[PDB]
Every structure is written in C-alpha cells, then in structure tokens.
Amino acid sequence: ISADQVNQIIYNLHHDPFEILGCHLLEEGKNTKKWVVRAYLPKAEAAWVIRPTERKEDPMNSVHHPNFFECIIETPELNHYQLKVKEGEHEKVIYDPYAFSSPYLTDEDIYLFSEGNHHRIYEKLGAHVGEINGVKGVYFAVWAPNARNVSVIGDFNNWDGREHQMRKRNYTIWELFVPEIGSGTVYKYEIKNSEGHIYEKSDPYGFYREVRPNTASIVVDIDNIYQWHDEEWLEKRRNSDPLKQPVSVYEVHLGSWLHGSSAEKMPLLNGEADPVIVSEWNPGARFLSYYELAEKLIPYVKDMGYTHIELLPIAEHPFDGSWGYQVTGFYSPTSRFGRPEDFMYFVDKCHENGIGVILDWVPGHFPKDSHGLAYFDGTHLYEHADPRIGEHKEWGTLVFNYGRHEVRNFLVANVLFWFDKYHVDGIRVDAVASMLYRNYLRKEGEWIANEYGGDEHIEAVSFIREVNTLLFEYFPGILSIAEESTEWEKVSRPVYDGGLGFNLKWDMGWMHDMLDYFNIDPYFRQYHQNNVTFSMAYYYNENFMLALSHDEIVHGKSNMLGKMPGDEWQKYANVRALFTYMYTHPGKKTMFMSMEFGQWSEWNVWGDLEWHLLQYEPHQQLKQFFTDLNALYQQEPALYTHDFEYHGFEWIDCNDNTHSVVSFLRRSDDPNDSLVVVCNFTPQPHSHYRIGVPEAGYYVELFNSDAKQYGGSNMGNLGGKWADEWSFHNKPYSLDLCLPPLAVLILKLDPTKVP
Ligand SMILES: OC[C@H]1O[C@H](O[C@H]2[C@H](O)[C@@H](O)[C@@H](O[C@H]3[C@H](O)[C@@H](O)[C@@H](O[C@H]4[C@H](O)[C@@H](O)[C@@H](O)O[C@@H]4CO)O[C@@H]3CO)O[C@@H]2CO)[C@H](O)[C@@H](O)[C@@H]1O
Ligand SMILES: OC[C@H]1O[C@H](O[C@H]2[C@H](O)[C@@H](O)[C@@H](O[C@H]3[C@H](O)[C@@H](O)[C@@H](O[C@H]4[C@H](O)[C@@H](O)[C@@H](O)O[C@@H]4CO)O[C@@H]3CO)O[C@@H]2CO)[C@H](O)[C@@H](O)[C@@H]1O
Numbered sequence: 001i002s003a004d005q006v007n008q009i010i011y012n013l014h015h016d017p018f019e020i021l022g023c024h025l026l027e028e029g030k031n032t033k034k035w036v037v038r039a040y041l042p043k044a045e046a047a048w049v050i051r052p053t054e055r056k057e058d059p060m061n062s063v064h065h066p067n068f069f070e071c072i073i074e075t076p077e078l079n080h081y082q083l084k085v086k087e088g089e090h091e092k093v094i095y096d097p098y099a100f101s102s103p104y105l106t107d108e109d110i111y112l113f114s115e116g117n118h119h120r121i122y123e124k125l126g127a128h129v130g131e132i133n134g135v136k137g138v139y140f141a142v143w144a145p146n147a148r149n150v151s152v153i154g155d156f157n158n159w160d161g162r163e164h165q166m167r168k169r170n171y172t173i174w175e176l177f178v179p180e181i182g183s184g185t186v187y188k189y190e191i192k193n194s195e196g197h198i199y200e201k202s203d204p205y206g207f208y209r210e211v212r213p214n215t216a217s218i219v220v221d222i223d224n225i226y227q228w229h230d231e232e233w234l235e236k237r238r239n240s241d242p243l244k245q246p247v248s249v250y251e252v253h254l255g256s257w258l259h260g261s262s263a264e265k266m267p268l269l270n271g272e273a274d275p276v277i278v279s280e281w282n283p284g285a286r287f288l289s290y291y292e293l294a295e296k297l298i299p300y301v302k303d304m305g306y307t308h309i310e311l312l313p314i315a316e317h318p319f320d321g322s323w324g325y326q327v328t329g330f331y332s333p334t335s336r337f338g339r340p341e342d343f344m345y346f347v348d349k350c351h352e353n354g355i356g357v358i359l360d361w362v363p364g365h366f367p368k369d370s371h372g373l374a375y376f377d378g379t380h381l382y383e384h385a386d387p388r389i390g391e392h393k394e395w396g397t398l399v400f401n402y403g404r405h406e407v408r409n410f411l412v413a414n415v416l417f418w419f420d421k422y423h424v425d426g427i428r429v430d431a432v433a434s435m436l437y438r439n440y441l442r443k444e445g446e447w448i449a450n451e452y453g454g455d456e457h458i459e460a461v462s463f464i465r466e467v468n469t470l471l472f473e474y475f476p477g478i479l480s481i482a483e484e485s486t487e488w489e490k491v492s493r494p495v496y497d498g499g500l501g502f503n504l505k506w507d508m509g510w511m512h513d514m515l516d517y518f519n520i521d522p523y524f525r526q527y528h529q530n531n532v533t534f535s536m537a538y539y540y541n542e543n544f545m546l547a548l549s550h551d552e553i554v555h556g557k558s559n560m561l562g563k564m565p566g567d568e569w570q571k572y573a574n575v576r577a578l579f580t581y582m583y584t585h586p587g588k589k590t591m592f593m594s595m596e597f598g599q600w601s602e603w604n605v606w607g608d609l610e611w612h613l614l615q616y617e618p619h620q621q622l623k624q625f626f627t628d629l630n631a632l633y634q635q636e637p638a639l640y641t642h643d644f645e646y647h648g649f650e651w652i653d654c655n656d657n658t659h660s661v662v663s664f665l666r667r668s669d670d671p672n673d674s675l676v677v678v679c680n681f682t683p684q685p686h687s688h689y690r691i692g693v694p695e696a697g698y699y700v701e702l703f704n705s706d707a708k709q710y711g712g713s714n715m716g717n718l719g720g721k722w723a724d725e726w727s728f729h730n731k732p733y734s735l736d737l738c739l740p741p742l743a744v745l746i747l748k749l750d751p752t753k754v755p
C-alpha cells in the first residue's frame with residue numbers, strides 16, 4: 001500500500017476503510033493464495049496476525065506510519081484469524097474489526113457453513129443491526145433448507161409476515177433485511193413446511209429472548225452495548241497454564257442462590273425491568289438480575305477466596321426445573337436475570353476482582369418444545385431422524401445430529417461465541433457419556449452399532465475433539481471440564497494423543513468414595529480405608545477436578561451436614577475433615593453453594609439458600625473455615641503447582657486403618673514449600689502419634705481443622721513441633737504429634753526457626 005492511502009486512513013479522509021483494512025486477496029498461486037491483512041491500531045507499537053487453526057503467528061510491520069500495520073500471508077484460505085495488539089507493556093487478542101464488510105451472507109459465508117467450518121457464523125445468522133442499500137435496519141437469516149416458506153413476524157408488522165417473506169439462498173438459508181427497525185425488536189420466524197403446515201419458531205441464533213414462558217426473540221446490538229475493562233485479566237489468562245495454578249470453584253445456580261422481593265422492579269446496569277417472579281407458588285419472590293448478582297455474589301465469592309465461579313447453564317431455557325439442562329436458546333443468556341449487557345457486566349466485574357467464570361454448556365441434547373430447534377423445518381433438521389441415535393427416550397429429549405455439517409457448526413460456533421462475546425474463562429460439559437455411546441440408556445435391540453460394530457458414537461467423538469481443539473487454539477489458557485461416568489479413557493488428554501481434549505475431568509469415583517466413606521459411622525471406617533486411598537491408584541490417568549457438586553445434595557441425598565454421622569459437633573467436624581482432605585489431595589477443587597455455610601436442607605431450585613443460618617455461630621464458623629482454607633490454598637504452591645505430576649504427592653503412611661489415619665507430602669518447585677498433611681478420620685484424639693518426615697527441623701502448623709475458631713475443640717500441637725531424629729515410616733526423621741479429633745493438620749518445615 002501507498003503513503004497517500006495510509007494517510008487517508010490516519011486523517012479520516014478515506015471514503016471507505018473496508019477497502020484497505022481487514023483481509024484482502026492479493027493473488028492466486030497454483031496451490032495457495034497470497035493475502036494481506038491491514039490494521040490501523042492507534043497507540044499500538046506492534047501487532048501480529050494469529051491463525052489459530054493452523055497454529056501460526058506472523059508479525060505485522062508498520063507501513064508508512066507507526067500505527068498502521070500490514071501482514072502478507074500465503075495460505076490456501078484465510079478464514080480464521082485474530083490480531084494480537086501490543087500497546088506499551090500490554091497485549092490483547094481480538095477479532096479483526098474490519099473482517100466483514102457486509103451484514104449480509106456472502107458466498108463464502110454460505111460455503112463455509114455448508115462445510116461446517118464457519119467459526120463466526122453467528123455474525124451473519126440470527127438478527128443483526130446493519131445497513132443495506134444505504135438504509136439502517138435489521139438483517140435476519142435462518143437455516144431451514146426444507147421449508148416451503150419463511151417469514152419474519154414481529155411487533156413491527158403485528159405478527160403478520162405477508163409483506164416480510166424471506167428469500168431463500170442456495171436452497172439452504174433464508175434471509176431478509178427490514179429497514180428502520182433496530183435493537184429491541186421482538187420477533188419470530190413463521191415457517192411453512194413441505195406439508196403446508198405453518199408454525200412459529202424462536203431464532204436459533206437469537207441473542208436475547210422474552211422471559212419464560214414467552215419465547216419471542218429480541219434483536220440485540222451485541223457489539224455496542226457494553227464496554228469491557230478486562231484486558232489485563234485476559235492477557236494473564238492467555239499467557240498462563242491454568243493446570244499449574246490454584247483453581248477453587250464455587251458452583252452456583254443463579255436462579256436459586258439469592259432471591260429478592262417481587263414488590264419492586266429488577267434493577268439493571270443503568271436501568272430496570274419488571275420483576276421476574278420465581279414461581280406461581282412463591283409469588284412474593286423474584287430473581288436477582290445479573291447486575292445485582294455482580295454486586296452481591298462477586299464480593300461474597302471474593303471474600304470467601306474462591307478463584308472461580310461455575311454456573312449451571314445460563315443459556316436460555318424454558319423451565320426452571322430443568323436447572324438449565326434443557327436449553328432452547330443456545331445463543332442467549334437467560335432473560336430471567338435481565339439483558340445481555342448485564343451478564344457482560346457480571347463477567348467484567350468478576351475479572352476486575354480476579355475471579356474466572358466457567359459456564360456449564362449443554363451440547364448433548366435439546367428438549368422438544370415447539371418454539372425451539374425440534375423438527376425445525378418439517379424435517380429432523382437439528383436432531384438425527386432415527387430415534388435410536390436421535391432421542392434420549394428416558395429423558396424425553398432430542399439428540400443433535402453431530403454428523404450433519406450445519407448442526408456441528410451451530411454447536412462449535414456456539415461454544416466459541418460464549419468466549420468471544422461474553423469473555424468467559426471455561427466450560428463444563430455434564431453427562432459426556434450421553435454423547436459418546438450409541439447404546440446410552442438404550443435396551444438390547446433398540447440401538448445400532450457404528451460402522452465397525454462398536455458402541456462408540458463416532459460422530460460425537462469427532463465433534464467433541466473438534467470443539468476442544470478449536471477452543472484451546474482460539475482461547476488459550478481456558479478450562480474445559482468434563483464429567484464422564486464410564487471410564488472412557490483419555491478424557492482430559494490432548495486430541496493428538498487419542499484424547500477428547502478436555503483439560504480437566506471430575507473425579508466421580510473420588511466423590512463417591514469420599515461421601516460413602518464419611519457417611520459411615522467412624523468406628524466402621526477401619527473396614528473402608530481403601531475408600532481413602534484408592535483414588536490415588538488411577539489418579540495420574542487424567543487431570544482430575546475433585547467436585548462435590550449440586551447433584552449430590554438433592555433428591556433425598558441430604559446436604560453435607562446431614563450426610564455425616566454423630567451429634568451436631570461431629571457432623572461439623574466431619575465436614576471440616578472431608579473438605580480439608582479434599583483441598584490437600586491432589587487435583588483442582590469444586591464445591592456447590594450452601595456447602596460453605598452448612599445449610600441443613602437439600603438444595604431446592606425453587607427457593608433460595610437458607611441465608612438466615614448465617615446469624616448463628618456454628619454456620620459462621622464453618623464459613624470462616626472455608627475462607628481460611630481457600631486463602632491457604634492460594635498461598636501454598638505445594639497445593640497447586642504439581643497436582644498432576646508424581647513429584648507433587650507421596651504417601652507418608654496409609655496402613656493405620658484401625659485408627660482411620662493417613663498422612664502424605666505435597667511438593668512444589670522449591671523444596672522448602674513442601675507440606676506434611678495428617679488426617680484423623682475418627683473422633684478419638686491421639687497423643688504421641690508418630691509420623692515420618694523427610695528432614696530435620698521445626699514444622700509449623702499452618703492449619704488445624706480442629707481450631708476453636710472453626711468450631712473445633714482446639715486440640716492441636718500449639719503452633720508447631722520439632723522433628724526427632726527417630727526414623728519412622730521409612731524416613732530419617734519423625735514428628736511426635738497430637739492428632740485432634742475428626743481433623744486434618746497441615747504442617748510446613750520452617751528452615752529458619754531458632755533452636
Ligand atoms: O478436654 C477434656 C477431654 O478432651 C478430649 O475429648 C475430646 C473427645 O475425645 C473428642 O471426640 C471431641 O469430643 C467431642 C465429641 O466427640 C462430640 O460428640 C461432642 O461431645 C459433646 C456433646 O456435643 C455435648 O452435647 C455434651 O454431651 O458434651 C460432649 C462434651 O464432651 O463434642 C465434643 C467436643 O466438644 O473433643 C474433645 C477434645 O476436646 C479427651 O479425649 C478426653 O478424655 C478429655 O476428657
Ligand atoms: O501406646 C501409645 C503408642 O503411641 C505411639 O504409637 C503410635 C504410632 O506412633 C503411630 O504412628 C500409629 O502407629 C501405626 C503406624 O503408623 C502404621 O504404620 C501401622 O503400623 C503397622 C505397620 O505399618 C506394619 O509395617 C506392621 O509393622 O505392623 C505395624 C503395627 O501394626 O499401624 C500402627 C498402629 O497400629 O499408632 C500408634 C499407636 O497405636 C508410640 O509410637 C508407641 O510407642 C506407643 O506405644
């Protein structure tokens with residue numbers, strides 16, 4: 001490019017920056033093409049073009065002006081890229097703001113979508129504010145290849161679509177531009193199928209939706225509603241390995257954490273809305289908005305010391321009682337809690353406070369409701385046609401046809417969408433077995449094997465691997481968490497090694513072992529020492545997340561206190577011991593709302609949590625215990641740097657089944673960061689109980705779960721103990737400890753204490 005052209009840009013004289021900025025073809029070779037990307041980045045000193053799906057990164061060069069950049073790249077197609085932009089000492093990675101000159105679908109958009117590879121399809125499908133033929137308005141487009149007709153109905157034409165019939169393109173997608181309407185518009189698609197049957201559909205790519213049970217889509221100007229402040233958070237994320245950091249997750253169902261009064265409006269970020277009543281049976285109560293949750297949940301979590309909040313699915317879902325697991329509006333956060341920008345504010349404020357956001361994501365199925373994706377165009381469009389692979393009969397839901405390109409594309413782009421538009425830090429997929437097996441919950445003779453005669457759902461396995469491949473390429477540094485309950489191998493291993501490509505897997509066997517263990521009367525735990533120790537036998541086959549989830553405190557399972565045997569004191573003590581053990585055992589941590597303050601009742605998704613309990617000392621003491629445990633966790637590198645390496649853990653001894661005692665070391669990079677952990681899982685205290693340690697010196701008691709400030713009896717070792725030169729447990733030194741009742745000790749060598 002010329003200096004004259006560059007200056008026209010720099011001085012705002014150019015007639016159309018899209019002619020010069022963005023990606024432009026320069027020439028076609030035999031086997032490849034030459035492209036240039038140009039960007040004008042005022043304040044940037046350096047920039048790079050990332051091609052994350054090819055794993056390449058090329059520098060851009062300043063051309064004629066220090067903030068005007070060009071990058072010449074040869075590759076057969078340049079569909080997928082990002083700009084990395086350095087301003088002083090900070091880097092951000094963004095999509096190119098000049099990537100798409102037209103609001104309408106181009107030939108290239110349609111081709112990529114037909115192949116299942118349009119990672120940004122939601123920029124074109126759905127509803128977008130833009131300009132066509134010189135007039136402002138909204139462009140709508142929808143995939144519905146077998147429909148006979150489609151119209152746009154909405155507020156703007158009183159729900160009569162005769163003058164807003166859409167145009168079909170390439171026998172696949174319907175489009176229409178409507179002038180002079182804007183964001184806030186309420187609409188649906190009216191579809192006639194091949195039988196002449198007419199019906200009404202929410203927008204599958206819609207960005208906002210009426211409050212359930214109403215289902216019309218709402219047009220959102222999604223790139224001009226919120227201003228973010230989280231660049232430094234996102235840079236740190238992208239440059240860090242989360243597997244090596246503390247990850248302590250507070251799992252939250254937004255609709256049931258805290259309720260407000262329905263006798264007042266729901267406040268929003270700079271606005272307000274009508275209250276959303278929680279249920280007709282509890283009509284005095286309303287949900288809190290994303291905005292109110294940002295103001296209340298976030299400081300609560302920050303003070304407790306968790307690193308992350310994990311949300312039960314917030315994608316739009318018609319029924320409270322599915323807990324979010326039956327989604328019908330995959331591209332919009334639920335309007336129960338307000339608008340898209342209020343959720344963006346929640347995430348921004350999490351990042352301002354140093355807290356990451358993980359979203360439960362539901363790609364495994366969708367329910368039958370007629371406003372949603374089912375039988376979309378008068379054929380089995382989203383779902384597979386054969387019910388033996390296309391329905392989960394025991395659940396009454398439909399299963400995506402992962403093999404069908406535009407369906408795969410809906411889902412792959414949907415995951416990316418949450419990271420792009422809402423800046424989230426991770427996803428968790430519930431029930432991964434439900435996608436992986438062709439015989440999932442199906443009786444003999446009511447499913448068919450794959451082409452090699454196996455039970456593996458080939459198409460789903462491929463989809464899962466593609467999702468995880470793309471997620472990590474576009475958003476390095478994120479968490480991708482699976483719950484898979486059949487010992488499928490290499491869940492949390494890279495795709496290049498025959499894995500599914502998640503980075504963490506819930507240790508459901510650990511969870512069962514531990515909760516089954518603690519539910520046993522302590523005298524009988526001597527017969528089940530193996531519950532304590534067994535999970536370490538297979539631990540290194542995955543990267544495990546130790547989760548005590550929502551699923552474990554419903555349906556007659558009790559809340560954590562009620563699972564524990566004995567009187568009120570021992571119930572609390574058993575909670576403290578279990579969770580101190582969980583936080584010291586290798587792996588990342590997740591626990592569910594209400595567990596941190598000892599709610600007695602099961603989680604009830606129709607009410608809010610029993611916050612009045614926090615008026616009372618035992619509940620306040622447990623909450624302090626977790627606050628301090630989380631603080632320790634973040635303070636001690638041996639609790640997080642080497643979770644997934646042999647170095648990070650070693651048993652000291654696990655043979656004393658008769659007293660239900662175990663002990664172990666955690667390690668990090670510095671040998672002085674080593675910790676000794678001692679667990680006593682009955683209410684019998686022990687005096688002069690020896691434990692082997694590897695070095696001489698004074699071992700400080702960093703943490704004692706029996707401290708009086710946590711509700712314990714305050715037995716302990718008075719702050720620490722000097723090791724004896726008395727060999728024990730095959731180690732040259734040993735500590736002669738008092739073991740408090742139903743309690744866990746964490747000790748650390750202070751190699752500078754004065755003898
Ligand atoms: O300090 C004197 C005693 O210290 C040691 O006793 C221990 C017990 O061994 C531990 O098990 C624990 O005791 C718990 C007890 O397990 C639990 O049931 C509960 O017992 C209370 C009960 O809540 C209450 O309603 C009433 O019956 O009083 C009981 C009081 O003992 O709470 C206990 C802790 O308060 O903790 C104490 C350690 O302090 C040592 O073993 C004893 O020999 C010695 O007497
Ligand atoms: O009477 C008071 C006694 O207190 C002290 O004994 C303690 C030890 O200090 C503890 O470490 C523990 O002993 C465990 C031991 O840690 C555990 O390994 C297991 O030992 C097995 C051993 O693993 C196996 O190799 C085989 O050797 O036999 C051993 C004995 O079973 O079980 C031990 C407990 O049974 O608890 C005891 C108290 O019970 C103090 O050191 C003693 O001198 C004192 O008598």
Ligand SMILES: [Mg+2]
Pocket residue numbers: 159160161
């Ligand atoms: Mg009509």
Ligand SMILES: [Mg+2]
Pocket residue numbers: 431
């Ligand atoms: Mg399950």
Ligand SMILES: [Mg+2]
Pocket residue numbers: 528
């Ligand atoms: Mg058993």
Ligand SMILES: [Mg+2]
Pocket residue numbers: 607608609610
């Ligand atoms: Mg309540």
